[PDB]
Symmetry: D3
Subunit: 165 residues, 6 copies
């Protein structure tokens, strides 16, 4: 069971708007970078340039750019052995959720690293995410577990203690 | 070409509970029921699984793993049987459950019809790239909702998302 | 949710050696034949002839026959919307199990109809089958449920009360 | 066993050049129309998407990315909805689009009926390994075209390719 | 061609508990550990999931749905990560768990190496068609078990099952 | 981001005829060998299965079903093990085997690098829709062949086909 070489190929999915989300991603990268079970980590926001767009994030983008960028992400999922999603429970990212469903449809494991800045609200989760994810590591209290998690086999850890939406 | 018998099997995805959202689903059903190209429609919230071993089933509480598995699988089964997905997509309150299955359906190479709804037309028209590119056909819920009754679900002609800022 | 036309396309998997197994299959067919939610039922033992085999069941078969026959079965699984397996708990059929795993890998629903002529033995099941199957209908006490089951949506019914092997 | 209703959903793949190719396609449709096992038939060249931004569109000419995506997806949607593929395979001028589709369908584990055509029945009979082993059923177009009218698409009985040299 | 680094990721499937079966798995590990083409080996029975909410975990009893889900998924995850499967197949006592994953792996188009074992060589040599055809490479456990240390898992060359009666 | 170890597993598809084709294949291997991102490279024509029952086997001649299955499966196994495909695509004589493989890989959602070659750089630039939209990255073989030595196969950056008429 002991890998002769790292085989964990990570698809790090995550929103990239607010500074918080930006901070989590930069850290998650630092953590995963210490994990000996990882061989490669892909982060989609690290892009394609359409020599025809005379372009802004959030603006109207060319179809060529859209296709190339969306494909770069699907390619990342294809090459990956598992997904790690810095999941924002406050501002739900539909892009991230899409990717989770896509990865599960491909039968790949998905580690959910939820984050919330509202401890007051009863921890609730949509069924699809709750039953779709294979392993959960609380981002607010276990973010560091990512540096040790064995990605060569991705041990399961069902979602529990969450009210199913 | 013209089908000999209805071939469309719809997986109707949509957020629920919310008053407006329930309204949409209800209207979506009526519209689909009028489509001659549809053989079957599956809506996840209709019937449910009852875990006789569940004391006071909290429709938002913890809920047993037995009910979770059985309910989740009923959804994957609907996706499996469907020929296409029709999603009543709320642009104001993004539903990750809906997004999950869109990606799940696209991974299976099945067509997905996105029906966006927004109560704030004055607000920015922006969509996540994965949704904008993942979807194969868009039908504005606020303006073309009625097209669901005429749309040919035997072939699901595509209609790329356009006119939305992308992030 | 009410189908305008039947959409249930059944892949009826089952051993076909003993007379018992042969009896169950003939009955399962009769039952399913009464179900209004079924549009078609495929039973693999209903074959290909290789005009080159100068052949016996259990004997050495030509590769052409093997390929054509195996494919006829995969084609049946491809066309099917769900599988119904007359599962023998006494004499485990690896062919049937293979097909269950194949169908689940394709995310299709699988109805397990177990049979046993040894009520004395503690009901035990292999994990993969127990967690792989989506719906179970006891063959010894609910065989008739197949005539009523709604195959247009295949309601879930997790396996319970079985010792996991 | 006997089907209560037609369940065959055919993806009719085919080059759409030379008068010979479009004529075979024509005949293919006629034959399929008379088959009681067929529920629906999709021919990629029958409809077509129209991109308003695209001016003076021409076949073989530079096309917009939007038109390309929509059209490609329409073909994949057809493959997804199909229960089996029927390819009018031109053995004289190999068509990579059809071959791409045969491979895509086999990856999805769907049956593929190959219907080869040659204007030179006397030249050597050779076939690429992937096509020869990828297809599940072969029906010669030059002498058995007509059985598309009777073939049982509810079950698609296999019939391995034999008699062709392999390269 | 020659790999720059081990690429083989094995999913070692096999029945357990039985004295002889445990022996095989143990020997299989040793043999694989000596293969230069292997980067990783996953054996389902090694480590396990503990459900802190499980009183007296009966290794054959009912067992919680939480443990079942988590354990089953650990297996599907091993199949997902693997590049190929190596199954210590007991021909005397057929293991449906092993058969399930063989089919699951073949549906994913992954290569499967079958390693049959029998304590009754005097008995009929027969194999189920699905196994005989589903498998891509066979290595007799009773006579070539040692080949597991030389086999190139970077390319998994096929070796069709032959010499077995088929039912 | 930077990979700890090479993770690119290439499926090198290519016709294996004319001296030109086998020479490109030769060069392709040389270039790939010098790419630090490549862990392994599979070329379908490098090894080969041998069927003892088969006597006087010849290329293009009638082959045994056992040889056909083994060889076809060896190619599918290669596609399964591969993280991406690289096709030395002959634009002058279309090869259905390569096209079949491109489609099979795209159905599995794997990236496909197309490397087109033409001995007539002046003739019209036209490509079949499925190939043009199916591939994720194009690298001209006639003027950019050499970048196979530097392309980042750990991530395979997309590069849509443009400049080709579509038919
Ligand atoms: O919501 C974030 C997720 O969706 C994808 N994504 C959304 N917008 C993107 C731009 Se602009 N560029 C690259 N990838 C992008 C990512 O996979 C990320 O996981
Ligand atoms: O298949 C996913 C669909 O299932 C619906 N759904 C079914 N039961 C659910 C409970 Se309880 N909680 C949250 N979502 C639930 C989602 O709206 C999604 O469209
Ligand atoms: O074990 C029985 C299962 O395996 C397949 N099968 C095994 N031997 C077969 C012969 Se001979 N002919 C046709 N199908 C056959 C069936 O799919 C059946 O479900
Ligand atoms: O992935 C399927 C493999 O899992 C093993 N397995 C893991 N835990 C199991 C319990 Se508890 N019971 C029965 N089988 C079990 C099977 O041998 C099969 O190879
Ligand atoms: O090359 C033959 C196959 O490929 C597809 N195809 C190639 N170019 C196309 C245009 Se322009 N429009 C729609 N479909 C097209 C067809 O599906 C056909 O089977
Ligand atoms: O036609 C080009 C492609 O198809 C395959 N192929 C066709 N005939 C073959 C014989 Se004979 N042996 C091994 N592979 C073979 C190759 O994978 C190549 O990419």
């Amino acid at each position: 069971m002991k890998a002769v070489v790292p085989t964990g190929k990570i698809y790090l999915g995550s929103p990239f708007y607010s500074d918080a989300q930006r901070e989590r991603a930069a850290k998650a990268k630092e953590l995963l970078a210490k994990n000996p079970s990882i061989a490669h980590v892909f982060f989609p926001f690290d892009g394609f340039t359409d020599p025809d767009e005379k372009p802004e994030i959030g603006g109207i983008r060319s179809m060529v750019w859209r296709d190339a960028t969306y494909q770069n992400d699907l390619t990342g999922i294809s090459n990956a052995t598992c997904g790690v999603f810095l999941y924002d429970m406050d501002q739900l990212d539909d892009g991230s959720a899409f990717e989770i469903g896509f990865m599960r449809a491909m039968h790949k494991p998905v580690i959910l690293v939820p984050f919330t800045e509202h401890p007051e609200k009863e921890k609730k989760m949509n069924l699809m995410i709750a039953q779709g994810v294979t392993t959960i590591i609380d981002g607010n209290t276990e973010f560091e577990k990512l540096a040790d998690y064995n990605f060569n086999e991705c041990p399961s850890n069902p979602v529990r203690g969450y009210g199913i939406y």
